[PDB]
Amino acid sequence: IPVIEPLFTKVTEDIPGAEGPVFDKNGDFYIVAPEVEVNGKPAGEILRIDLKTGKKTVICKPEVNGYGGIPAGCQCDRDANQLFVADMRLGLLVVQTDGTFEEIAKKDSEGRRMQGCDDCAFDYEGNLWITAPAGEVAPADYTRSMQEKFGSIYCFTTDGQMIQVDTAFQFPDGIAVRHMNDGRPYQLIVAETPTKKLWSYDIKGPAKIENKKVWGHIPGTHEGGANGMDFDEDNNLLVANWGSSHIEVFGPDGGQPKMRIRCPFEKPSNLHFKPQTKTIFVTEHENNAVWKFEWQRNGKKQYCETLKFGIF
Numbered sequence: 001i002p003v004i005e006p007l008f009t010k011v012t013e014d015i016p017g018a019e020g021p022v023f024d025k026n027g028d029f030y031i032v033a034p035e036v037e038v039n040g041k042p043a044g045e046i047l048r049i050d051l052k053t054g055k056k057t058v059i060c061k062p063e064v065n066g067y068g069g070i071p072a073g074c075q076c077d078r079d080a081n082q083l084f085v086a087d088m089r090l091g092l093l094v095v096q097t098d099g100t101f102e103e104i105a106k107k108d109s110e111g112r113r114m115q116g117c118d119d120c121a122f123d124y125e126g127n128l129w130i131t132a133p134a135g136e137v138a139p140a141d142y143t144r145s146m147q148e149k150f151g152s153i154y155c156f157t158t159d160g161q162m163i164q165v166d167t168a169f170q171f172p173d174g175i176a177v178r179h180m181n182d183g184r185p186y187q188l189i190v191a192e193t194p195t196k197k198l199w200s201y202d203i204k205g206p207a208k209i210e211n212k213k214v215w216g217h218i219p220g221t222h223e224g225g226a227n228g229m230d231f232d233e234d235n236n237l238l239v240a241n242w243g244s245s246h247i248e249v250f251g252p253d254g255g256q257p258k259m260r261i262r263c264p265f266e267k268p269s270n271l272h273f274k275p276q277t278k279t280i281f282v283t284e285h286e287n288n289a290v291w292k293f294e295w296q297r298n299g300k301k302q303y304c305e306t307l308k309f310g311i312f
């Protein structure tokens, strides 16, 4: 498999558990530090990074009834400039740029207690697909599905429903949605970290997935595996292979990676394209830092880059 070694430029550092890189509608950049702790307890943070100087500012340190969060993944909303954040302790949060936030759900559509979330992906219809590798949210004692298959997948719909769409995953992590050229969501990709697999489903409609299949295989026998992921504009899927020192590049049909991107660190955790550019920002856990490098083409537009109105 061909391997390219683009130049990685440092963006910022000292971000415990650096994760969930995301750009909002104004082009501002944010990341999360899920592993920040106080007295051994969760005190995860959501930060804004001024791309010039690299100055960091903690805009939100989420806590619900004394329980600190472990913010791990983000997606920017389209109709409002607010961030949807997957939190391993608090579930799904909606965070404002001013730092205020709200807890979206303590229970799902079936009345079952909500599980801690890791990453999420908005499809163009505005539905949010979420991975939930943790056990029940706070105040329940914290648990993760790295050993046991109790990780779930949710779809938070436009009509406000938190619907569990699948279960029994061994640490579902990265997630992405593939769209037809006309914008219709039709495939959901989910990373199952320790099993070194990428699963796919046909998206038949909001919160409706079927035909679960082992879509891709993550290289290596190292500890770790697929973490965060995103599509480029040609629908190639770039996947951070935590512990492999590489970001894997899958073609539209999956299978084995068609190319690998060598990183100057062993633990890439997540990535995100800067709108209208070939620049990919990468978070990593070897140095708990953020970097950027130039990919071969622009990224696939995120939901926040699409227009609710307009004509085309």
Ligand SMILES: [Ca+2]
Pocket: 019, 072, 073, 118, 119, 173, 174, 227, 228, 269, 270
């Ligand atoms: Ca993740």
Ligand SMILES: [Ca+2]
Pocket: 021, 228, 229, 230, 270, 271, 272, 273
């Ligand atoms: Ca991303």
